[PDB]
Symmetry: D2
Subunit: 239 residues, 4 copies
């Protein structure tokens, strides 16, 4: 990985990446493993966790994976316990896991998205805090989205990610005493930096690497006084 | 009611007030009925809907009430249908219906609050739009809360009301073509205007009347170009 | 004036309206005078202050006017003194007074707009507070603009009005102990409520009356616990 | 400098750092020079530009300095011209340059702070864009402050930095077509990462290094799709 960060920046650290088997989660896992982290991939599909862990191992990285539906509280409790039994500590967590007009969204559709894009990340963060981070300090990055003026055509995802942005701030306040930082990233339209439509002022679509580098920055010692903060990665499309 | 608004401002209009049997909902219902509206009180408890409808009738107002759990989609669909069969049109909707450290909030606790403080209001607004307002225009006001920097000690309510603030914006955008305005109010600490702790710059607690007047303003013709907007009623405590 | 507010709502009150001789200032002055206020029009041009005061007098209202460049501190100090000598108290203040790519804005152009759209309103508010409102309580409404995601094509006005929005919050905090509320209105594109382009979700341009009613609401007893708050009047165009 | 970024990340690049002779500007200049940048220090005092350039040269870095009052437009025009004659290109710009109750702030006091904390940075950015960056692309980082809910006790600085935050967004939109990113950092209370009061949830004061790393991140290829974005560095104190 052609990272902007110095080699070995995350040597020896255990970092959970939910949704780690695909997309931005997979890109971020790869960059963190290239920087020396032991990445713990979490996701619903064991098959793409396996394949992405396969890539990371071939590329010389250190990785483990767990198949888990993080939308279920008992599963998350056991997941975090199983990770701690294997690793001893969790240094960081990346909550990466997660279209219709409002008039067409059903109660079940709205609630499924809340569980996927808000409740799941809340449960992983709560258990990571309760079981480990409340004792050690650490940092958490939540995946959001460009919902700042609402999210037309995706109102249920906007409400969920707005909820997750609020949780980010609340947790930054409530958990700061334990040395725990909680931040977020809000990518815009993601497919010219590649370490791995025209209503964008920069006039291009972003890359997975362009989201991962912001996530990695927020986990790094350089972000040690950054908490409660969302980095938008949208080419200024939200402005 | 000693309202700041002119008599008869809402003559002949049907206005749904969820959570209408108590607190801010009851205060707002009273002011709207004093201004000539036919207020339709909706709530889980028939007993306090009955008693508040009793007060409004004695005070010379026009009112109906329906006991309904608005957290259930089929019930809401029938509720709105039953209101339209009785009234013909719904001119406005007030979504008024709705403590623990984050570490202690369970999945069921978090999800119950999302359903109460986000999903319920979404369902009433969606059905009011789908069954009537999409054809006539109208306005909707959602109850929020002071969650702007998160809501420590009430993280689940903050995430829910942040979600409801996002829905307010999304619905203002998606439904504006139908002549539908969607706005919100975010009260701070509510118990010197009474038409019916010291970290507040105004150095007092707010009143129910001080929230109702903002809700009524947003339903009025004076707010005809106000949409997607949240009025904070918190004595500047959020600043 | 066909106001949504009850007759006599501002009986006996002295209200300063800067920029009161034209546009939104003139509309707001007319509505406040129709509600019984003694409106004090302030502006650079005596001729349009005279003509608007003429209209208000013919329409049966109470009004005085002062020609003053509020961008000059000594003039403002004497202005407020002269108003207090005539009226005894100032109950409310409406700061209403106030295109180029950024690359073309000169230092003098940028600074002229800061003085017009930020410094002037700061000086009037400061003197109104220092000379009277700090002793009596009262409320202030500042005119802003739709600058929430910046103000492309009008970057100097956006920076000025963002500065004025910040002042609104700071003053709400610093002056709340004196019973002084400080709020703002941010109109969007202003030319269906008329008490006196298609990237708008409501699909129309706003009216002067649709801004004035929000200003009047913020001065009213109904807004007694509203401070530090900006009402956007933009048809949801900012969302 | 013990930077989190890989050696040579800014090899061969010319980066202007206003206010570069002291504080956060000096810390950021040192980190960028340690990463291979040619840092151009700009400030009012030649003596502390000289001394900080002395440190950077001793530490093995590449640096030039110009004494300039950036609050004056003609001086800035010549400054940028002189830098381009020496360097050929400007790859990045760090606008780092920049207490009283509102009631006590005079027109001259308010205006001096606007010129220092808003106009100066606008002029440097405008000329850097007009003379060079509009042709090459590049990125700009503006120093702000924690003014999100106003800035009590520092109302003039809050209005100025809110104005500068607005300019950041406007410039990100207007200049994005040229490949120019414009971002900001908003430090909170700055004096546990040191690469070079108790109302903070993290329960400590931040360091200069903890601001510089965020600035450096925003200039880096990792931030290539980040524009119009402010990183708060305040230990979650603003939440």
């Amino acid at each position: 990985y052609d990272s902007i960060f110095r080699p070995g920046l995350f040597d020896g650290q255990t970092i959970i990446v939910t949704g780690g088997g695909s997309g931005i989660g997979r890109c971020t896992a790869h960059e963190l493993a290239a920087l020396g982290a032991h990445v713990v991939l979490v996701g619903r599909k064991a098959e793409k966790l396996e394949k992405t862990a396969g890539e990371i191992v071939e590329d010389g990285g250190s990785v483990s994976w767990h198949a888990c539906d993080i939308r279920e509280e008992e599963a998350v409790k056991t997941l975090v316990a199983n990770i701690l039994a294997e690793r001893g500590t969790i240094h960081h967590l990346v909550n990466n896991a997660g279209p219709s007009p409002l008039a067409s969204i059903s109660q079940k559709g709205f609630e499924t998205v809340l569980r996927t894009n808000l409740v799941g990340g809340f449960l992983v963060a709560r258990e990571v805090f309760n079981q480990s981070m409340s004792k050690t300090g650490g940092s958490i990055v939540n995946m959001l989205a460009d919902m700042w003026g609402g999210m037309p055509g995706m109102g249920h995802s906007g409400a969920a990610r707005s909820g997750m942005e609020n949780f980010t701030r609340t947790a930054a306040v409530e958990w700061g005493h334990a040395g725990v930082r909680v931040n977020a990233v809000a990518p815009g339209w993601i497919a010219t930096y590649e370490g791995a439509r025209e209503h964008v002022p920069l006039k291009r679509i972003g890359s997975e690497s362009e989201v991962a580098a912001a996530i990695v920055f927020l986990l790094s010692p350089g972000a040690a006084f950054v908490s409660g903060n969302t980095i938008r990665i949208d080419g200024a499309a939200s402005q």
